[PDB]
Amino acid sequence: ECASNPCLNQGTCIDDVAGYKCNCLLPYTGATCEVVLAPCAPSPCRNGGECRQSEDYESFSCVCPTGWQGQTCEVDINECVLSPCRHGASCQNTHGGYRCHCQAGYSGRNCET
Ligand SMILES: [Ba+2]
């Protein structure tokens, strides 16, 4: 049976009494190695997170952009818990960001300049 080279994506074939079997090369899988393990294919990350597949292709992780957290980057980070706003400025936590309201004579994103 293996003389028909049925295993795709360069998997190796083994003749057996029941039927042949394919030893597939990750990330390929399935009866004839025709399926691709692709845990990032559904685009599971949110808010611009970068999906990264595991070494065994069974799972994913998300690398979240600044201000986001959670397994899929859906959870807001509250920068105001330890406020970065300088020179007396108030901190306002927003969805996906934060705002520093500067006291007189100060400016910049963190009221640093
Ligand atoms: Ba925020």
Swiss-Prot record:
Glycosylation positions in this chain: 4, 12
Localization (cell): Cell membrane; Late endosome membrane
Tissue: In fetal tissues most abundant in spleen, brain stem and lung. Also present in most adult tissues where it is found mainly in lymphoid tissues.
Residue span(s) of domain EGF-like: 1-34, 36-74, 76-112
Coiled-coil regions, chain positions: none
Disulfide bond positions: 2-13, 7-22, 24-33, 40-51, 45-62, 64-73, 80-91, 85-100, 102-111
Domain of life, per lineage: Eukaryota
PTM section of the record: Synthesized in the endoplasmic reticulum as an inactive form which is proteolytically cleaved by a furin-like convertase in the trans-Golgi network before it reaches the plasma membrane to yield an active, ligand-accessible form. Cleavage results in a C-terminal fragment N(TM) and a N-terminal fragment N(EC). Following ligand binding, it is cleaved by ADAM17 to yield a membrane-associated intermediate fragment called notch extracellular truncation (NEXT).
Recorded disease: Aortic valve disease 1: A common defect in the aortic valve in which two rather than three leaflets are present. It is often associated with aortic valve calcification, stenosis and insufficiency. In extreme cases, the blood flow may be so restricted that the left ventricle fails to grow, resulting in hypoplastic left heart syndrome.
Assembly and interaction partners: Heterodimer of a C-terminal fragment N(TM) and an N-terminal fragment N(EC) which are probably linked by disulfide bonds. Interacts with DNER, DTX1, DTX2 and RBPJ/RBPSUH. Also interacts with MAML1, MAML2 and MAML3 which act as transcriptional coactivators for NOTCH1. The NOTCH1 intracellular domain interacts with SNW1; the interaction involves multimerized NOTCH1 NICD and is implicated in a formation of an intermediate preactivation complex which associates with DNA-bound CBF-1/RBPJ. The activated membrane-bound form interacts with AAK1 which promotes NOTCH1 stabilization.
UniProt note: domains: Interaction with PSEN1 causes partial unwinding of the transmembrane helix, facilitating access to the scissile peptide bond.
Family to which the UniProt record says this protein belongs: Belongs to the NOTCH family.
Protein function: Functions as a receptor for membrane-bound ligands Jagged-1 (JAG1), Jagged-2 (JAG2) and Delta-1 (DLL1) to regulate cell-fate determination. Upon ligand activation through the released notch intracellular domain (NICD) it forms a transcriptional activator complex with RBPJ/RBPSUH and activates genes of the enhancer of split locus. Affects the implementation of differentiation, proliferation and apoptotic programs. Involved in angiogenesis; negatively regulates endothelial cell proliferation and migration and angiogenic sprouting.
Record's protein name: Neurogenic locus notch homolog protein 1
Organism: Homo sapiens
The encoding gene: NOTCH1
Portion of the full sequence shown: 794 to 906 of 2555
